[PDB]
Design brief:
The structure is a homotetramer.
Chain A lengths: L2 E10 L2 E9 L4 E6 L4 E7 L2 E2 L20 E2 L5 E2 L3 E4 L2 E4 L8 E2 L11 E6 L3 E10 L10 E10 L3 E10 L3 E2 L3 E2 L2 E2 L9 E4 L1 E4 L13 E2 L11 E2 H5 L4 H6 L3 E6 L6 E4 L3 E7 L3 E5 L19 E2 L1 E3 L12 E2 L5 E11 L2
Antiparallel strand pairs in A: 1-2, 2-3, 3-4, 4-5, 6-16, 7-10, 8-9, 11-12, 12-13, 13-14, 14-29, 15-28, 17-26, 18-21, 18-23, 19-20, 19-22, 22-25, 23-24, 24-29, 25-27
The structure holds chloride ion (8 copies) and magnesium ion (8 copies).
PDB class: isomerase
Keywords: structural genomics, PSI-2
Assembly: tetrameric
Chain lengths: 332, 332, 332, 332
């Protein structure tokens, strides 16, 4: 049967930290932490399809992002500045001259949760209240995340939010995928004809450039390591992939594959930000993960070159809705 | 036919007090009072499945909770305090050092009502306006309760609300179930692996504890009286069950049974607070009910240990929606 | 075919006054005025089922109510006063010591309109903006009325509204029905066990009274004239029927019949206010209508005895929705 | 397959200008610019059905309107004044004594965009944030435009918006149609019995006039050039058609035809404003288009004679929704 359960493993911020398991009748078990509404593991016949830390306890010892619901804004904001009309709002500069990842972001907070299931799905709904002014963002914000598993081995991620003030909001699920192997060795096809080259600060500075003729061309199936180990100046600059790709609208958004498994990625986001875990090195808390072991498909609106953030602006009471679907299937 | 009617029996607060009857074609009659949007009786072939007072008039003579729509917050709030950001709001201390049951709560107000029916349901919709600042709660609040009976002997309870200010809201239906017998003698199975132990003040103080190895273990069908008459320190502390149970997500939330009847409880709440009518003693207005005659399944977000009430916070204009389904069927 | 059209006949308030015709394939033609979103005629095989003035031009010469969308509040408000919390708002005293019919109400304004049709319906949607403070009511208000005709000779009336401020709103469609004859001679059955007796000022003063044993008993089919010509003190007081009836929830709300036609009335309102055109006398602008020629079924929340108007209070941005269905069929 | 793609061709306002192509399996390709959410081309078996500039780059060199999403208000506002209650708001006088086309309107802004497709549709969703006070309009505004192509050669246009302040909003899609020929030579049938004659300033001054007996009568199929070359005083005044037509509600709103093609126009707007490109003259940036080469069917609420703009007033948080459907089919 489709079923759910959870176990409490710790306390943080006067709240319980739990590990929630969703199971189906098709060989899949999904593990979620209410800490950061974090996707911890995706087990297909016992094999983990994503990067995970050594233990659930490890996730809250420091900020390592993997699996997390990162907000209020995932990625960078130039000079931490948001201009609307003749007004500019200043966000905290936690990334040198810029702002990144919401400051002390939502991936670091303990969310409330509620598991449920029916004849078609096993799911967990998570909620978080973030007060007006937290990390200098305007608006009381209510966030709702759902991870929902069906019998077709599709894991659906839904992230909804509402603010009571004009604000900016562009969160992302920060899961790294490896299909039980290493992302460097995996094949990728992606329906994106353009990417955003970035500057030394890691932000776009000239809008879209064609992927054609560059390391970023995944229009035809290509080994990820071919891009990572190329002499491409943008790859060298960011020590691997660390780049927004602008989707062309054809389905699926991305298809990641090994000889044994395939992952089909779909989303209502306009972009995928691909980061190949360029900084991992088998040390510290994350000693079980090395460089290029996993790759994100961060489904969000792309980071912007400057203070025009119209795309990610929410009116008071406007419903934000992000969907991502990760479908796991058998290889060729 | 599915049908409705009502009778006026009294006046209170310059309004009429009525008793509304919903009937189906499957042997069920449900009686509702617009006073407190209160579930008065659930008759299955003439046999009452819930605790009821001697007469409808008795419900409004004093606060005895049974059947009532208790709000704005059912249960306790530590120190009556709600912290959001750097702001704390103080609620009335009607429970010693703490706040309980909304002060002069919604179970004590006269709601407006409207019966209706169709080929599938007989229902009554009830509404209440609670002004900003009543019982020191922020926000004008509009509440809508519905009791809806179908031909499958399911009684659906829907409780919706909206506030025009940032506020806190966690109401509950306070029906006590007995299946025409005494709850102490009934069997219970409940899909909850954790409960919240409470302190001397009746509030949680350490988050979840496993039900395994305690009186609170209803994972396998167990006579309620076995828990009530056990030497468990938490049972002794609260003179019986008076505890939040955190649901594991598997269906149903609870199954209460006698040899003759079963009640299947489903809800979109994350918790059930179980209270076994520990204080009843066949005296006063409630002289027809004794200790442990009935048990609640209060479907709400759980009472919290402190002033972090994020789970029950509503933005202005945010729709709150609680569902409970009580399905009555024949025994084994 | 289901079809619509309109003709312009006059100018008022720098706007065009039009008469809109909805037609079906089942012998029905419905005439609507954008002046007051007014139901002008309901023609079944050429025979008018409702009271109408001599000409469309007559409707805007003075306030005669028939067919009109009367708001913001249809009927009386005691002392013109609305109490919410510790605040009381004062409405204009256009009814002696009381307020009635919204002051210079929405039945006196020129609405915008748009006809449309499809394979199932012919309809006209009408809209009106009423500014904050008009007739001393709070809130900018957007009203939307729809008259929609199908091939089953059902005319659906939908009235929706939203305010940007906490406010009170209880409009009604003021159509008088006669089935091409005189209402005094028609039979009526109504699923209401209670009515609200009124005082000398025409307002309720003691809540519900049983219809049983009074002129107001239409639980079993009865000639309307039997009530009108009875010695009942409430009938004498109001010179006929002028009374709220509280619906019991069984279907339909009312059934009005002659030997040739029947009208089946359904509504999502809790009450019908019945007024038998007690003041008409074949004089003035309305010289074609005499006493008791038609009867309203004003589907609204009932007039209240005092300043507690919780039932009709709207939060800012709360959607009000009233439906009425008038189905015309062949007699027995 | 239904498919989408886009190409970047320029930069403007620190954003990329792209040309988005939607294609189906029925011979249609639609080209959209994110600059002004502009409909650039509609190709049916290689033949363009609408007016287009020489190149996508031409659209942003100056304001020429064709294809554009023109807002916040398309068309004129008398004296630039909006009266609500006792308040009047003043808009910029960019049209002599009047206001027109939103000032520096939304057809001149770079919108964000996202293509997508499925088994039934190929679409592009575009969004724009317009700050409070831009062009002296109140309210932060979020606009969403969608162009959606199906396999029946219907192109659907959806335009939605929400403001956080009481405001006025009446945008339009400004596509000119020619069916690969010249509009002057095309036949038109239109289900509108009334038009709004205009004054020297191009605004209505007397409400509706019958089309019967005038050049504006398209109730029966008529060559557009017959109206354009007539001696009608309103045609002479505006150098061709430049007039609101008020729809009668029968389907379709308009049918434009050549010997080879037909265009079926449907809309939820109450009016179509018809402008026959009266000013084009094969000079300047638009040197490829001459007088009467194309005709708009601007689906909006009609321009008003004065400061009563109730029809186009939006409450804060009220959802505006315009639909237009353009279906292209084979001729007779
Ligand atoms: Cl801006
Ligand atoms: Cl490494
Ligand atoms: Cl907080
Ligand atoms: Cl006892
Ligand atoms: Cl009140
Ligand atoms: Cl008379
Ligand atoms: Cl006004
Ligand atoms: Cl020319
Ligand atoms: Mg601060
Ligand atoms: Mg390694
Ligand atoms: Mg106070
Ligand atoms: Mg006893
Ligand atoms: Mg005033
Ligand atoms: Mg007469
Ligand atoms: Mg300004
Ligand atoms: Mg030419």
């Amino acid at each position: 049967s489709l079923k759910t359960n959870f176990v409490k493993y710790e306390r943080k911020d006067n709240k319980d930290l739990c590990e929630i398991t969703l199971e189906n009748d098709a060989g899949m078990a999904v593990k979620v932490l209410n800490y950061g509404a974090t996707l911890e593991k995706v087990l297909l016949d016992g094999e983990n399809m994503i990067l995970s830390l050594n233990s659930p306890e490890d996730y809250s010892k420091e900020r390592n992002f993997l699996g997390g619901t990162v907000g209020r804004i995932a990625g960078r904001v130039r000079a931490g500045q948001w201009k609307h009309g003749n007004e500019i709002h200043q966000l905290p500069l936690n990334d040198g001259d810029n702002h990144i990842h919401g400051g002390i972001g939502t991936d670091m907070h303990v969310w409330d949760f509620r598991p449920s299931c029916d004849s078609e799905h096993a799911r967990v709904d998570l909620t978080l209240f973030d007060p007006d002014g937290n990390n200098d963002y305007p608006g009381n914000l209510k966030l709702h995340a759902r991870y929902e598993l069906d019998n077709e081995n599709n894991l659906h991620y839904l992230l909804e939010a509402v603010s009571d003030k004009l604000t900016i909001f562009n969160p992302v699920n920060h899961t790294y995928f490896n299909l039980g192997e290493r992302a460097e060795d995996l094949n990728l096809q992606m329906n994106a004809d353009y990417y955003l080259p970035v500057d030394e600060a890691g932000l776009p500075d000239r809008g879209m450039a064609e992927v054609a003729g560059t390391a970023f061309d995944f229009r035809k199936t290509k080994r990820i390591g071919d891009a990572l180990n190329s002499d491409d100046s943008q790859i060298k600059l960011r020590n691997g992939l660390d780049h927004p790709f602008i989707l062309n609208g054809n389905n699926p958004a991305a298809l990641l594959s090994s000889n044994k498994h395939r992952l089909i990625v779909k989303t209502n986001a306009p972009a995928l930000v691909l980061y190949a875990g360029n900084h991992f090195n088998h040390t510290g808390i994350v000693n079980n993960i090395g460089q290029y072991d996993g790759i994100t498909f961060e489904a969000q609106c792309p980071p912007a070159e400057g203070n025009d953030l119209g795309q990610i602006t929410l009116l008071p009471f406007e419903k934000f809705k992000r969907t991502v679907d990760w479908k796991f299937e058998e290889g060729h």
